[PDB]
Amino acid sequence: DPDFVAVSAALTDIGLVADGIADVELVADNIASISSLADTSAPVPQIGLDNQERIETDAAGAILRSITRDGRAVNTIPLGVSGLDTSGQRLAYVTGGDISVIGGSGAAVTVPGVANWTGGPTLSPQLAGIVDGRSVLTINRPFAQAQQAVMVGNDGALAPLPDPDLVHILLADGQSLSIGTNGRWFSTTQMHATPVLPRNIWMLQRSGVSDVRVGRQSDWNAGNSTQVTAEQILGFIPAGPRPLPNVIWSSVIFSESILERAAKIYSDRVFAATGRRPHVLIIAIGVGGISIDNMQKTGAATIPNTTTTKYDQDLVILNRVKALLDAQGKRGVVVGVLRKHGETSSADTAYATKATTQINDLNTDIKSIFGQAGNPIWIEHVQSSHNAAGIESNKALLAMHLAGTLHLAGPDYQLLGRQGFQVTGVTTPPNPDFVHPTARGYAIIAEEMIDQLWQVLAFNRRRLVTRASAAAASGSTIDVTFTSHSGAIEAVASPGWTDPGNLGFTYTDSGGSVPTITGASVLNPTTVRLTMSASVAGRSNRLVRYALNSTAVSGFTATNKPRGMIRDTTSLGTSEVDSETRWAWAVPAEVSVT
Amino acid sequence: DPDFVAVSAALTDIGLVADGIADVELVADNIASISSLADTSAPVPQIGLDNQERIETDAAGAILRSITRDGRAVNTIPLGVSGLDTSGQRLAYVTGGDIS
Amino acid sequence: DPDFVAVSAALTDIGLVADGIADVELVADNIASISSLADTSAPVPQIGLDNQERIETDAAGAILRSITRDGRAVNTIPLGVSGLDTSGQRLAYVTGGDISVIGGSGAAVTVPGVANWTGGPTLSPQLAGIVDGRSVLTINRPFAQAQQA
Amino acid sequence: PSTLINRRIDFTASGSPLVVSTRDREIAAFTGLTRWYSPADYANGHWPDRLNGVEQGVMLSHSHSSTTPTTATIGGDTYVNQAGNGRLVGFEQALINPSAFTLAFVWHPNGLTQTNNWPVCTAFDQVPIPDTNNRALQVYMFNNAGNIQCRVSASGATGNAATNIFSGWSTFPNSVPVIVLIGYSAAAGWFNRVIRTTGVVQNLTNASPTTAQTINLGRLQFGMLFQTTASSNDQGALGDIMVFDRNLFEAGNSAILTSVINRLTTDYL
Amino acid sequence: PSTLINRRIDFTASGSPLVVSTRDREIAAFTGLTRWYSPADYANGHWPDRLNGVEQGVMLSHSHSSTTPTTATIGGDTYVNQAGNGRLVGFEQALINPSAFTLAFVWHPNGLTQTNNWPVCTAFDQVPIPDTNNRALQVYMFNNAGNIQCRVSASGATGNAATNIFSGWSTFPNSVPVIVLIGYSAAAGWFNRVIRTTGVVQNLTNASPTTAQTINLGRLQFGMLFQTTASSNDQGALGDIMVFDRNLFEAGNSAILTSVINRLTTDYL
Amino acid sequence: PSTLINRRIDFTASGSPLVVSTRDREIAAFTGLTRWYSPADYANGHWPDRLNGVEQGVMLSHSHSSTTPTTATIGGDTYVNQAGNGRLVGFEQALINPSAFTLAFVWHPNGLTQTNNWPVCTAFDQVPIPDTNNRALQVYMFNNAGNIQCRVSASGATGNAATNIFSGWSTFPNSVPVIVLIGYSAAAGWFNRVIRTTGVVQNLTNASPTTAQTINLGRLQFGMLFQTTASSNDQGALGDIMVFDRNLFEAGNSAILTSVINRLTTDYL
């Protein structure tokens, strides 16, 4: 039928008319009077209303909105506040430097002012005001100026105050672990842990290839290294994981880094606390397998297949970022630095001093370049890939964490049970090495580390990492005391990995007898008992190590990898990566007895 | 088949529709302008909406702003703060008597 | 036939249109006046305006209100703050424990920070902020969570 | 009643859309409707004002110590079933304007044996000592073996004493719902109309009211008369109760009254 | 002016409605209107602008040590009575734009005995000395035994003597109000229209003005000559003043002119 | 997109007006349009989505270690010129909807010297391995002696293998820009349309597609083959790319198609 084909050829317009038929019939029923049924705009003499430049009136003629002489619209109907006329308000009070949050679901939440670690800042919070029914405070913690403005979250989290012209910069400086090496697998049917990221997150844009690592296949051992000059970085692009070789997934070296997941979680936390997505910049800097001596600033060496050192490359990238931000009109602040080091120079006894000097030099350069007033928060996940003699790295890491220079999130062997180093099953033309984690392991590391950073920044509370503090020997029996954020500490029976002998304990003394541990047990939920093979009383340099026993002299596998067997009894909440319960596993440690 | 008998029954409606196909297309092309003038205000029982004395709704029917029991308008869409949603803010902190 | 199934799917829309065909033709006949006295609403590409999702403009074309990426509505014309654009306000100042009201007329009113009786609580007021021209403080008197607003 | 404003071209919201049934939209749009009660909102012996809300509207609450009435489904329609045990009294405020008013209520006798039935009476707690010069509205439903006659009346010297307002009334059977409408103005006079699903059985008027033939107080009590509980309690059911501050029977409001009658007929008839 | 926007489906605002007389609405809506002074708003000494308000508009202030001009009632209408003691000047603002303007005002003689009147002249305190390179509006009113003739002129080199723009002036009696309209434009030339109650009694046009007749300056003073206070002061009453930034006598604004006189004639004439 | 509301009567905001070209307003009003890539927004190897913006849309990023393609003004129009050395991939996001989609892009050959070109193919970083169970859209340009045949195919088991969907293959010379439209619907099958500056070259349909031709995923890439850096590239230029959620070739959407073809032909052909 001609009418049928006519109606079929214009079905979209007919559907739109069907959707709007109510309005169409309402207009048609008053088509003659529609001139008098619309708003009327007319000018009136400005006598007696010199203050009210413009007037809006209702049907009865009463004033609804006016415009004052200074251009501020004033509503006759008062605007209800978002905290008093709508449910949900969290005010703040100051008690001896502590911030007490009022208006919560139950009892008040107390955020301490004095930080736990030695180098922590003593906050002196002052109630700046109320915004959106939430308490905005100002504290003496240097973020961009000498003081920082923060906003109280739903649970009391002092999130950084949102600012469109302020950009949060999250760095990742370290070995190939921070670069994102060999992390090209998340599940059987998905390669990237975070295929998409929320709004307002960027990396550096290059001429042809823009990515987390700024388009350089950085590798000290491999000769296919690349450097980036300031003239090549152009702008910013929307976030996302990017593989560098851009070849099939079997030949990809670096695909996904911890930076994407860390930035996504940080942005989500800030949005939850305040209500606005922050500006987050993602920059990953580093070269695989640098010694601690070559990461310095004074006596650094030149990267192979390159003409500049790693420190010079970092300075060039930071200067270009600052220039780009100045051109765009924003301000750059480095919120925190993600560090992963300790798999190459582990056999160096002076690792602590060199790492501290490098961290201090980088902090000074960042402060001078971006114009900040405080050091960025330095957090690092403890690596668990070293030879038998690779102990000085973790020892120095613990020493610097105690000294307050670093913040520890946890150990690297937790990925052994969460498919971190190897997925349940995939096609593997190359053998999956256990030193470099996959995308799932990178996501787990990023989640733990960003959680530690959020705890340090928002709550001003460093989450305690389960570690051995001191031990006392009594004949052929010894007792090791463990410090944890919850106090109660337990040994896991059936984890995802295998038991490391004496529940991951090792005894070493400067003697020819060296009685090894013959039994391990838990006496109380705080201390751990070790039964010696022979009496050890009266010896010298009696040292006890946890999560430091290893036998990987040629390759790293799931059985010879150093690992622990002991965690805390209180969970940290279900993770957002694999929906698996998070735990505070014990950091590798070495303690001299008393 | 139900579809074919329905089409046969509604052939009359299709006939009226195809009679004014050009008018339907013209209305559809400017449906925004037609709908912009169809604003209604009809009283409704206040049971279940004791707090909201006056309610304004969007096209989908969701509430945009409402007058509370005191007479203060509350917006479902929050209004952006000048110092938070716009590139300008100057905040004070008392240090040793001075103002930073 | 795809045309047949499309018409079967859109039969209810076709019937709804046919019910008010007279109103549709009446509106179409007078489209000039309606277009002259209506508010346009058309989508535009969101380039250069990533922060703005929905944009409202006056007759000239200048932006009046916009919707940010986080759902907050931003008004180009600033909204008058109560207390500063209205002839009335009350602010507070903490003097050694007492609270002095400043926005009042004539003289400052003093609220004691110490109790009038031996069993009363001491108050250490802190200016939480400014709400609708007036001053909101936080005091140590326990009301619901050991601190009152 | 809250005023709902619909905007077509505006910023989209995020909450769940607010939907109001077209029945409520049409009922609330009636001109002069002040108080509107529906049995669908009855709960635990307290009847909130549907139109004006719980806070802003007077709420009818049970007063006696007998069993509280519960909602019952008769003929597929919801009703407030008072088996002679309910005394719904509006305290501290007047339900109906005592100078010009219209009261329309649906009464469904689901089978009764009591001779006397008083669905609307003066409040037991009438503050100004109700007497000859303080008259309140009353409705007496006198039941025969199978016939009922509804009579509007005023209150005399005693609260139980009733002064009639009409001379001759019609009868309706025991098992039929009935819409009762009463109207009063200072000029038009008393009007009354009693309607079933078949036709208007009763239509009465009185344009010459004496001193005792007018009402001065607008507090109404449902189910019982005064403070007497021995007998004559209203056994039956109640439906929609509508109060208009203006008389719909007065000339010039014919369209509104016709719309109300038609709506009540398609609802409860 | 203040833009009054009226809504129909907006929330009710609790307050006294803001009412504006239809006269003000019609007057303020004139196309090209810039300034408007009304005697009803004349304070006790100063004349505030009505269209732009006191804060924004130019305030015609009295600037002499003599008795301040007062407000008088003539024939039921309100006027500013200048008995020769008032010099209302706009001090630091330009009243008209010399490029194109139209000044209209209502003048009412009050039984004049004085021969020469100067209702409008150059500003006495004016910054640039009025000479052959600085000329502004001057209005001269000559009395001949009860008949008034008006002349529009541009100030000369001396600052007091002015060169006339139009030649040939009709006489009108000194007991009736008169509407005087003086328009100037670059592409139209000088126009003058004087209207009495009977009708248009004077219509003059100078489409080719000389340099000495073209006006460059832009400040006016009401009620006195340029720095002369002896015998040239204006005698009578002054009414509404309207200043338009366009030329009402052009070929495109003619209808607008029809809307102006009809408003003035219905008001004072 | 971004809905724009232009109030007729409202307050005046002191700011520059928001300038939008009529072409952009017309293009953004196409019902069913989802993605729109224009060569004016292309900048240094990244091609942001104009309709959805940079933040929400997907950037087509260059993914090779060669000289990045650059914007070139050729044939009197702007184009994204790739000298067989660049490939633009949408990283970890889906461009088209497998259930139903319409991809229309403008391709201008620049005197092809190759025999096999792949302006559209399946991404290399696919999270599922492209096998017989996962098929993707591919566009094959076969140039023999200066004559080019355009074929639309689905990826096979090996990924680079292509299974054709249409039998006939018309030919157009390699000297004029062309418009390629591909559409897939569940209830309407496949549709292809190749349009030259003079008229339709190929009008091919496939209403009964087998499993080997049905689209399963929605990830696409432009400009190069995959895992084979060899003599199989795209030595042309894509002018505009448009991805519509619905199938424009359907009769109900036919009135829309006539519009969009009327647009590109105005701007490019």
Short mmCIF file of C-alpha atoms in Angstrom, two decimals, chain B:
data_model
loop_
_atom_site.label_atom_id
_atom_site.label_comp_id
_atom_site.label_asym_id
_atom_site.label_seq_id
_atom_site.Cartn_x
_atom_site.Cartn_y
_atom_site.Cartn_z
CA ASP B 1 -0.98 -14.02 12.93
CA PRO B 2 -1.52 -11.33 15.61
CA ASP B 3 0.90 -8.91 13.93
CA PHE B 4 -0.82 -9.09 10.54
CA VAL B 5 -4.35 -8.77 11.94
CA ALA B 6 -3.18 -5.84 14.08
CA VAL B 7 -1.74 -4.15 10.98
CA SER B 8 -4.98 -4.80 9.09
CA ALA B 9 -7.01 -3.28 11.93
CA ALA B 10 -4.70 -0.25 12.24
CA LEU B 11 -4.53 0.34 8.47
CA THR B 12 -7.03 3.16 9.04
CA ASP B 13 -4.69 4.86 11.53
CA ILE B 14 -1.81 4.37 9.10
CA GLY B 15 -4.00 6.02 6.46
CA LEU B 16 -4.63 9.13 8.60
CA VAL B 17 -0.93 9.23 9.49
CA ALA B 18 0.22 9.02 5.86
CA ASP B 19 -2.35 11.67 4.91
CA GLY B 20 -0.39 14.22 6.96
CA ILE B 21 3.10 12.74 6.70
CA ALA B 22 4.65 16.10 5.77
CA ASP B 23 3.03 17.79 8.78
CA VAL B 24 4.28 15.00 11.06
CA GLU B 25 7.82 15.40 9.69
CA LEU B 26 7.68 19.18 10.13
CA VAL B 27 6.48 18.83 13.73
CA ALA B 28 9.16 16.23 14.48
CA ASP B 29 11.92 18.44 13.07
CA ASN B 30 10.94 21.17 15.58
CA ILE B 31 9.73 19.04 18.49
CA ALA B 32 12.01 20.87 20.94
CA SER B 33 10.35 24.22 20.20
CA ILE B 34 6.89 22.65 20.47
CA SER B 35 7.73 21.05 23.82
CA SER B 36 9.39 24.19 25.21
CA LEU B 37 5.96 25.84 25.66
CA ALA B 38 4.18 22.86 27.27
CA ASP B 39 4.78 23.70 30.93
CA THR B 40 2.02 22.59 33.30
CA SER B 41 1.11 23.26 36.92
CA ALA B 42 -1.58 21.03 38.44
CA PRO B 43 -2.13 20.61 42.20
CA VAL B 44 -1.62 17.15 43.66
CA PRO B 45 -2.36 15.65 47.10
CA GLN B 46 0.37 16.37 49.63
CA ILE B 47 0.25 12.96 51.33
CA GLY B 48 3.66 11.33 51.02
CA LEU B 49 5.18 14.74 50.15
CA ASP B 50 4.65 16.63 53.40
CA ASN B 51 8.14 18.14 53.33
CA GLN B 52 7.91 19.32 49.71
CA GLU B 53 5.37 22.14 49.50
CA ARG B 54 6.03 22.81 45.80
CA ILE B 55 7.67 20.39 43.36
CA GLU B 56 9.19 21.12 39.95
CA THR B 57 9.91 18.19 37.64
CA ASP B 58 12.03 17.66 34.53
CA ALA B 59 10.98 15.97 31.28
CA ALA B 60 11.49 12.46 32.69
CA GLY B 61 9.45 13.37 35.78
CA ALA B 62 12.28 13.44 38.32
CA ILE B 63 12.36 16.30 40.81
CA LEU B 64 14.66 19.23 39.99
CA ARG B 65 13.94 21.61 42.88
CA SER B 66 11.40 21.57 45.70
CA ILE B 67 10.22 23.98 48.39
CA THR B 68 10.62 22.50 51.87
CA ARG B 69 8.20 22.88 54.78
CA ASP B 70 9.98 26.09 55.82
CA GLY B 71 9.89 27.75 52.40
CA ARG B 72 13.53 27.32 51.36
CA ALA B 73 14.10 25.90 47.89
CA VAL B 74 16.30 22.81 47.67
CA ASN B 75 17.86 21.78 44.35
CA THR B 76 18.26 18.12 43.43
CA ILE B 77 21.23 19.17 41.28
CA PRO B 78 23.71 20.84 43.66
CA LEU B 79 25.02 24.28 42.76
CA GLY B 80 28.76 24.51 42.15
CA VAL B 81 30.79 26.33 44.79
CA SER B 82 32.67 29.38 43.51
CA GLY B 83 35.98 28.33 45.07
CA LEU B 84 35.68 24.64 44.15
CA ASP B 85 34.12 24.39 40.68
CA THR B 86 35.79 27.57 39.35
CA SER B 87 39.49 28.44 39.05
CA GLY B 88 39.73 30.79 42.00
CA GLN B 89 40.15 30.48 45.77
CA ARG B 90 42.07 32.30 48.52
CA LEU B 91 42.05 30.53 51.89
CA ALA B 92 43.51 31.80 55.16
CA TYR B 93 45.47 30.06 57.90
CA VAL B 94 46.54 31.62 61.20
CA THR B 95 50.27 31.16 61.88
CA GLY B 96 51.83 32.86 64.90
CA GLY B 97 49.26 35.66 64.74
CA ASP B 98 49.94 36.37 61.08
CA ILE B 99 47.64 35.25 58.26
CA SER B 100 49.00 32.98 55.53
#
